[PDB]
């Protein structure tokens, strides 16, 4: 069977994964599940995924609940030999130390940005606070990109896939100005034809955003 | 070369990966990093780790900065073939899925309730919040254990040395009394002789906790083997 992917394209990890879809014309049967009508709650969705998050890969019997799993896995699976998802160890551990970075450090800090504006108000969140440690992000980005063009070497990986989404949406609100290397590197990103997958699920986001955080953004 | 470890053993992923270690019988060169006493700030290890973060590791020209990389490069090195990264690609990924489950879920939660107490102080911290929250991750280990026998299927994978670190210390606050699949596998890890590198930097972190946010964990929550 071809794999299902349950979805909400306002999330960037599920971003990373229609981009690495489209760059691979991977055949997938797309299911809209809608983050903010709480449709991840829906007892049959909780069944499949307790941690009710999108994206969600089911694949045969193998059903996988995080964006990072699902590129690898796809890579794998559809990408054997190809670059995007390295074949010698030491080259696919510095992809799978960036798609880390991603999910613990540049997401988990993207999401505690976003999640304030929902919970407590665009007005009511510590703006400060959240861009000190937003911009420490891009901070080391911008160290990633000193002796590389991509995110994890001379050549595009799964890692640039993951990163760019969430880049993206945080520069909703923090500019890039002040990162040379980071923002030629996002120029360069939105230059790939499979970038375009990008460009739906991020303006959806800018806008339900604006609505339930009662501001609009820079 | 040898991998060089940067550890705090009072980081649950430092004692995953610590455990990994003495489960395959790697010799590793230890180098003390002191959580809280900042020396993660200091000029030549942000260098290293412009993330700041334990453990790190450095095996010849690699360097690693997340504990879960760590445990997939370790596995590959030093149990090629075994059964805790299976070779398998379904069970592989299946692996891979609650690695990642740690990470982004277990830990993240576990990580904000420990640093809203060193910041605030416990007694201002909203510890009914953070109760829900990380119930709620021990309810999904615990649907994960009625489907399986470990965290990732019927052996020992590299999720349940991940897991079972970060949730010793959960339970340091937060009993399993409602949970007895976890509470059996919580046990059974606890038999492991692997688990004796957990059991150091546990009470090191309780202890240090503890002093920082001005308060005592309830001794009748950690479960004891």
Redesign the interface.
Same mark, same amino acid.
């Given at each position: 069977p071809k794999p299902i992917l349950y979805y909400d394209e306002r999330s960037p990890p599920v971003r990373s994964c229609l981009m690495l879809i489209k760059l691979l014309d991977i055949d997938v049967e797309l299911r809209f599940v809608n983050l903010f009508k709480g449709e991840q709650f829906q007892k049959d969705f909780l069944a499949l995924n307790?941690?009710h998050s999108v994206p969600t890969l089911v694949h045969? %019997? *193998?059903? *996988?609940? %995080?964006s990072? !799993?699902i590129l #690898?896995?796809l890579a794998? @699976?559809f990408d054997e030999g190809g670059s995007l998802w390295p074949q010698e160890? !030491?080259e696919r551990? @510095?992809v *799978?130390?960036l798609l *880390? $970075?991603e999910?613990? $450090?540049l $997401? +988990?800090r993207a999401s505690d940005f976003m999640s304030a504006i929902v919970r407590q108000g665009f007005a009511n969140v510590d703006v400060a606070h959240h861009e000190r440690k937003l911009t420490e992000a891009y #901070? #080391?980005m911008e +160290?990633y990109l000193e002796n590389s063009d991509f995110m994890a070497g001379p050549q595009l990986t799964l890692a640039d896939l993951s990163i760019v989404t969430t880049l993206s949406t945080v520069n909703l609100m923090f500019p890039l100005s002040q990162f040379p290397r980071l923002r030629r590197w996002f120029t360069a990103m939105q230059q790939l034809d499979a970038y375009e997958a990008n460009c739906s699920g991020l303006e959806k986001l800018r806008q339900t955003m604006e609505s339930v955080g009662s501001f609009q953004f820079p």
């Open positions: 307790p941690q045969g %019997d *193998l059903v *996988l609940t %995080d990072h !799993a #690898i896995h794998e @699976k160890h !030491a551990m @510095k *799978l130390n *880390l $970075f999910c613990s $450090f $997401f +988990r #901070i #080391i +160290r």
